[PDB]
Nucleic acid binder design. Sequence first.
RNA 1: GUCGAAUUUGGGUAUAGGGGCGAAAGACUAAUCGAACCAUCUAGUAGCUGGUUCCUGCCGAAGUUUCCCUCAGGAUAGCAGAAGCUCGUAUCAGUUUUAUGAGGUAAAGCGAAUGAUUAGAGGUUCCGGGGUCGAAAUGACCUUGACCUAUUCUCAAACUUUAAAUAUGUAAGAAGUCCUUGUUACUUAAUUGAACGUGGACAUUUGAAUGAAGAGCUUUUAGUGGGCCAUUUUUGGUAAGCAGAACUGGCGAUGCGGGAUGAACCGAACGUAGAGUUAAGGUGCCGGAAUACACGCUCAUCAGACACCACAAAAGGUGUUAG
RNA 2: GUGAUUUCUGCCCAGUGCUCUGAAUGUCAAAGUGAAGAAAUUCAACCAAGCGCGGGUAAACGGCGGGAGUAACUAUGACU
RNA 3: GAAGACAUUGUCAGGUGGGGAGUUUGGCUGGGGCGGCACAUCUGUUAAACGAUAACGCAGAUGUCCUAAGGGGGGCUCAUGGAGAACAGAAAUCUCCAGUAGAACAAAAGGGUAAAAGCCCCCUUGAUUUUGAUUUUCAGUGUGAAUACAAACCAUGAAAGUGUGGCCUAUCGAUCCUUUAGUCCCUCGGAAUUUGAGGCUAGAGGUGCCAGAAAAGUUACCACAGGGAUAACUGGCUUGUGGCAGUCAAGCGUUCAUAGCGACAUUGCUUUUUGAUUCUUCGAUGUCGGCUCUUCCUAUCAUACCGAAGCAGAAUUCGGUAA
RNA 4: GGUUGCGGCCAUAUCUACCAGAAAGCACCGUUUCCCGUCCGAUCAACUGUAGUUAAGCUGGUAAGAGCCUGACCGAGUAGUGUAGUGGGUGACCAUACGCGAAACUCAGGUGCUGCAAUCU
Lengths: 159, 218, 103, 104, 58
Amino acid sequence: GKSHGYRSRTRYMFQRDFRKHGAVHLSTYLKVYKVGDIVDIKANGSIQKGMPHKFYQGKTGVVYNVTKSSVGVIINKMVGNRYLEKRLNLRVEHIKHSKCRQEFLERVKANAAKRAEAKAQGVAVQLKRQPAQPRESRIVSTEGNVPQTLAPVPYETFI
Amino acid sequence: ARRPARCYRYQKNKPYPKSRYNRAVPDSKIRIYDLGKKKATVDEFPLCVHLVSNELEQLSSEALEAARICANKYMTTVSGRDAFHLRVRVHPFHVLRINKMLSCAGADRLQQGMRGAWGKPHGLAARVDIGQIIFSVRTKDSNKDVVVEGLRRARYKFPGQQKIILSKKWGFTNLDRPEYLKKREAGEVKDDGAFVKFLSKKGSLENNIREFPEYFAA
Amino acid sequence: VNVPKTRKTYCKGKTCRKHTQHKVTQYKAGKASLFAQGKRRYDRKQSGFGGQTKPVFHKKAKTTKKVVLRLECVKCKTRAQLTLKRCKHFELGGEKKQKGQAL
Amino acid sequence: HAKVHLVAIDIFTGKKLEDLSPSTHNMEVPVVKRNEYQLLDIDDGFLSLMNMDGDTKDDVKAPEGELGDSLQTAFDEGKDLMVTIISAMGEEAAISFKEAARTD
Amino acid sequence: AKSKNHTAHNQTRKAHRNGIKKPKTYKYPSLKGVDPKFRRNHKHALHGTAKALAAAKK
RNA sequence: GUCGAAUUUGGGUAUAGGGGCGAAAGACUAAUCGAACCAUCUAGUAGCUGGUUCCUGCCGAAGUUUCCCUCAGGAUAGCAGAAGCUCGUAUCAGUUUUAUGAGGUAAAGCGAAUGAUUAGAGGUUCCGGGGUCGAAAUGACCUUGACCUAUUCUCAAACUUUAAAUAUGUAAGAAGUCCUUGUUACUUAAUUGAACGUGGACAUUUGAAUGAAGAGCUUUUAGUGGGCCAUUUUUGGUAAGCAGAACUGGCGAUGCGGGAUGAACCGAACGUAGAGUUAAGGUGCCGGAAUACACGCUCAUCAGACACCACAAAAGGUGUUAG
RNA sequence: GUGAUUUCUGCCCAGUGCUCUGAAUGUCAAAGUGAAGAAAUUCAACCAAGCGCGGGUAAACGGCGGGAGUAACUAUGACU
RNA sequence: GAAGACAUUGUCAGGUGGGGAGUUUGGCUGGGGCGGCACAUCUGUUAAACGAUAACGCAGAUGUCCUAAGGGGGGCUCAUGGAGAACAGAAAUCUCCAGUAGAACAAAAGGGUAAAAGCCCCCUUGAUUUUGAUUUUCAGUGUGAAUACAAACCAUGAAAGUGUGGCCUAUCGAUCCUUUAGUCCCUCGGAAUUUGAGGCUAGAGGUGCCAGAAAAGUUACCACAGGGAUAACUGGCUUGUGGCAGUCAAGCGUUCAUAGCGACAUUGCUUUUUGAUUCUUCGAUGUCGGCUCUUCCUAUCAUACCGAAGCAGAAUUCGGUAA
RNA sequence: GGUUGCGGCCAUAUCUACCAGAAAGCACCGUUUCCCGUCCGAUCAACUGUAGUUAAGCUGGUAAGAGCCUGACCGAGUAGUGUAGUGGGUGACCAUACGCGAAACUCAGGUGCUGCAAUCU
Ligand SMILES: [Mg+2]
Ligand SMILES: [Mg+2]
Ligand SMILES: [Mg+2]
Ligand SMILES: [Mg+2]
Ligand SMILES: [Mg+2]
Ligand SMILES: [Mg+2]
Ligand SMILES: [Mg+2]
Ligand SMILES: [Mg+2]
Ligand SMILES: [Mg+2]
Ligand SMILES: [Mg+2]
Ligand SMILES: [Mg+2]
Ligand SMILES: [Mg+2]
Ligand SMILES: [Mg+2]
Ligand SMILES: [Mg+2]
Ligand SMILES: [Mg+2]
Ligand SMILES: [Mg+2]
Ligand SMILES: [Mg+2]
Ligand SMILES: [Mg+2]
Ligand SMILES: [Mg+2]
Ligand SMILES: [Mg+2]
Ligand SMILES: [Mg+2]
Ligand SMILES: [Mg+2]
Ligand SMILES: [Mg+2]
Ligand SMILES: [Mg+2]
Ligand SMILES: [Mg+2]
Ligand SMILES: [Mg+2]
Ligand SMILES: [Mg+2]
Ligand SMILES: [Mg+2]
Ligand SMILES: [Mg+2]
Ligand SMILES: [Mg+2]
Ligand SMILES: [Mg+2]
Ligand SMILES: [Mg+2]
Ligand SMILES: [Mg+2]
Ligand SMILES: [Mg+2]
Ligand SMILES: [Mg+2]
Ligand SMILES: [Mg+2]
Ligand SMILES: [Mg+2]
Ligand SMILES: [Mg+2]
Ligand SMILES: [Mg+2]
Ligand SMILES: [Mg+2]
Ligand SMILES: [Mg+2]
Ligand SMILES: [Mg+2]
Ligand SMILES: [Mg+2]
Ligand SMILES: [Mg+2]
Ligand SMILES: [Mg+2]
Ligand SMILES: [Mg+2]
Ligand SMILES: [Mg+2]
Ligand SMILES: [Mg+2]
Ligand SMILES: [Mg+2]
Ligand SMILES: [Mg+2]
Ligand SMILES: [Zn+2]
């Protein structure tokens, strides 16, 4: 009859890539993970040990534990009408920093430096970002760029 | 014996082709797909016409058989067997399922209803789109009138509306008349037994040299 | 299956506390004795009229039984046991399997 | 409903037995096996057999069946006695006698 | 006498009637499941810190 | 039908209920019989049908998850009320933006893997089947087939290089950042690290948008666990006002204007009244509202007249009209 | 059980029953017997009927099959 | 007279005992039954590119097997093809070249694997112990399976490491009772010793209807509660099947398509066949057929009037207006 | 810049056929008493650096080279798709409004970069 195994309906989700089978380049293990890092989860079909269940594919969480060769992660899963926090244990292969924070800290440090240098002359640093403002008035000249006139096209079968 | 065609006029189910999973199908009625002087060169038949679809349907292999037979036989009887090259451009690859049920009087004692009503293969069909070619014919310009009439007489076997169009291409190539003509008067066109190969700008130079010699012999 | 007649394993014998040698024997039930609380209560209830009074089992479905080994430390002389998955055939005395031979 | 009435003959005793069951009762199905043993010199009423490898089975005791008598008769001139053994639930006896006198 | 077997109809509405609120957050989250070897150190570490501060502020 | 006998019949007497009696029908036993009548245990048990008696006000549902000899029933979770409690603009939001992830559907491809598929073209047999020349030859000619090479026509839910839109994860700060130096039995070749701290520095532009009707928390319990319809995606079937799913909105529980008529369609949701303007729909008359204005088409010896909606096709016509 | 008379009531005892065997390496309860133990108790050997095994029984319940070749036209099949 | 410590009688024990008593005789389901298991599970697809998602949907599989097919280490590289070597040939063994896996990895399929996860060799038992934490099904219970540490004892390798069964996704089991191992621990309640018994921790004995009752039929002599949640009539939707009608033209028709026919196709119509579903009725709509009686429909058998013919007349055929 | 050892990124780095390569380095290259492994000092082991050769490996270049990578108003704002209507059509299906937006194809360009340490006319 029906069937729901541990790895059901993952046939494409866990395929490795095109032209990328084989061992893994060492940079992944040369990474270093601190408690509190925000990390994305992408399964790697080559290492059956310590895989994440398909539901946690492509999700993002916060590390909370570190062991000899694996990592503890916290995820929020929507079950019923609430969220429950699940704790996972994953080998370092299905793991990679979400560079969202990598860039965000860049913004923060640049922000602080900007604030300080602006305060060096007291000039209202104006920190917050803005969405795309509507563009401004402007003049367009036609020198060597005389307007060119179009017209709709008649019809033919083109075969 | 054969269920009327109106029961399979539309595309109602996903394509269901014969494969290692089907393993029990009949054979399509259509076996010959290119007719006429098929060994003709490319260059002796410039004119080309198409029988194009203006619908979204399924065509029974039997219908293809009837149309092919009628069109071919007419084209032969009038214009001589070697004045055209006719070709079908579809293939029945979609299997059609049927739920065979007892048809005796008093079968109420045996029929079992739709309880377990998976079908059984009994006929093939081909799926066709708006703007897809069905029949393609190439011949000399002197026979446009006869060939177009043959195709018109052929449309009557197909369900739905189909147009007849005169392609502005040379033969079955992907080129229009003047472009092919200039390219052929230049050396970069070498015919093959049925189709034609084209000298390219890419490739290993001496290999291009060994063929198309007169093109380099400028 | 085939299982060696000897095996070296951790032995919690209050003297061993380290892997020691161990003979192996297959678990056997042991004779069901009277005077046990269950049996004697059951006899009391079965007495008198009423006929059968406790359920009797009919719908046997499994064909095999988990096999259980009986380990003893050759030094400390204490008995430990452990289990194996189901198997229709079991065998301790084993002619060790070979590869090169033909049919 | 639908029930089953069946008659089956005993494997070893040869007696005739029969019963009927509703078509849901699953009475036990015995497990048997044919082994293709070889017969050595016929000793006293026992039988003396041969594995493909071993010298075992001083068991089933030279079947008294009339085909057993025919086997005993055909034995004394030899010609490569082949036999089979049925061993349903331990109680076992030889059922079939056969010959491959090739040794070539 | 069949019976309609399964569906998720109206489940989304029935849920969103009350929020899908984020679970919660806190300082000092639970330490259950963390590396016990690390926990054993950390406990004595805090112990030593607290003793040092008490003796200093004394 | 039978009428001299296995005949008909009065009175007495015998047989009492799981018992009697039966020339045999499951018949008879006080109109009661495939288990008589009377009382009591007894208001017997019921997952099943029927009813359930005053007014107003406020809030307001489910026909779904899991387990059950469970399928007309329960438990559990979900949906609801009530009681409140701790605080007072927030650790919020069925939303967008910015930044950063994950995916193998639509589409597309087969002169790219797998599988299918039409046609010629060029080679290749110490090697296929042959025929012709030959006694044969690793001798020649034709033929069929194979095999290889470059092309060509067409496909896939259990194929795929590529790869959408819509849906979806995380972050956008004080629980932060920086600086200095304390603790440890952990770890490091090592005061190196790790983790938590001491102390100091940085505020309303404190780190996008918009809103916030307050925010958060706890109990406890009713009803519910037969659903149905519509657009869109979609499975079996020829189909169905059929059966089965996905997302959303409805109907049930709901009236009001319109579709004549109707649970679902269109508008729009309702305390009680007055005035004004509109929706969807209409403006010959029934009927409130222009026999308004304007450019064209059509004459039917079964015209045509409005979505869901209450049906018509392939094929034809010097009917007519414009191309 | 069958149903005047007349005329006949064929074959099968493998199965199920009934009956009759019990010389017997079959099986067995309670009582009793022997051994071990301080005792509770344990373990042995022994056993009636019955059953097992072996005959009779169909006016007892009942049952009473297939496949091939064959004769001078063919055909069939006395026959094997 | 007969019989005699035997009969008989009393109490236990085994046997026989539908004559009699009590009781049961699963669920799913396009009515129910027969059928099958969708009744616990696993692979791929249906599944609509997160997740979840039904059908007696599609293609399949499990109730096992393995002291190695586990663990570690080391060496090597496969399927296939070409070219050569006595017997030897399409196939034996040897050698070289090509070889991204086209092979193998217990088994179904799908992933994954090349100085390996494949093949061969060496050493071993981590298929061990102590209890926790976490993931999947989910109520965030259990069972199953799996993951990451901790504390010992180990194996392997020079070593870093690796190892808590099978490369990953399936291969399995509560309370009571019996039994085994551990502690040699607690208790037998007037106090002692020794048997015996009862307890704590951890396994085994099976519940496949697989979150787990112990269970054979018949009712046409039947009974009760109910059901239109569900069958047999009519009625409504659908038209496969049944019946009826066109479009096309290869041929038939001595010649010639249509005088009349008409293959291979294809578009419809009808509800007088039979299916298909289950909307209404199971507190009852009297269910075959015949008899009598009225009206209606047209797809016309005859009658009226016409047209056409392979229509001399005669006769006949086709067609139109027509109920 | 060349070369070597250890690498990162993993083809712009692979493959096919040719041509060149100072110095050093790498390499092929000589031998079998010992540790050691083989059917066989071929691989692996050990010793010499002496007897020789850049022939090969390796590096670099060459090809209207295959492949591979990048880009483009080339294809195409097409295919596809979110949202709307009492829009069209008997229907199959199709336009229209506000939005997002492919692949193939064509053309053009490119054919390894780089870290640590040592050594080199
Ligand atoms: Mg992927
Ligand atoms: Mg008593
Ligand atoms: Mg008793
Ligand atoms: Mg179901
Ligand atoms: Mg009767
Ligand atoms: Mg009476
Ligand atoms: Mg009452
Ligand atoms: Mg149950
Ligand atoms: Mg209910
Ligand atoms: Mg009810
Ligand atoms: Mg409940
Ligand atoms: Mg409830
Ligand atoms: Mg998919
Ligand atoms: Mg597609
Ligand atoms: Mg494509
Ligand atoms: Mg393919
Ligand atoms: Mg997103
Ligand atoms: Mg209540
Ligand atoms: Mg329900
Ligand atoms: Mg209701
Ligand atoms: Mg409403
Ligand atoms: Mg008003
Ligand atoms: Mg008026
Ligand atoms: Mg016209
Ligand atoms: Mg006794
Ligand atoms: Mg006896
Ligand atoms: Mg009874
Ligand atoms: Mg049922
Ligand atoms: Mg999904
Ligand atoms: Mg293995
Ligand atoms: Mg290895
Ligand atoms: Mg669990
Ligand atoms: Mg370890
Ligand atoms: Mg594993
Ligand atoms: Mg158990
Ligand atoms: Mg016990
Ligand atoms: Mg169960
Ligand atoms: Mg009964
Ligand atoms: Mg009945
Ligand atoms: Mg109904
Ligand atoms: Mg019916
Ligand atoms: Mg029909
Ligand atoms: Mg029909
Ligand atoms: Mg009718
Ligand atoms: Mg009905
Ligand atoms: Mg009724
Ligand atoms: Mg009534
Ligand atoms: Mg009536
Ligand atoms: Mg008419
Ligand atoms: Mg709307
Ligand atoms: Zn020990």
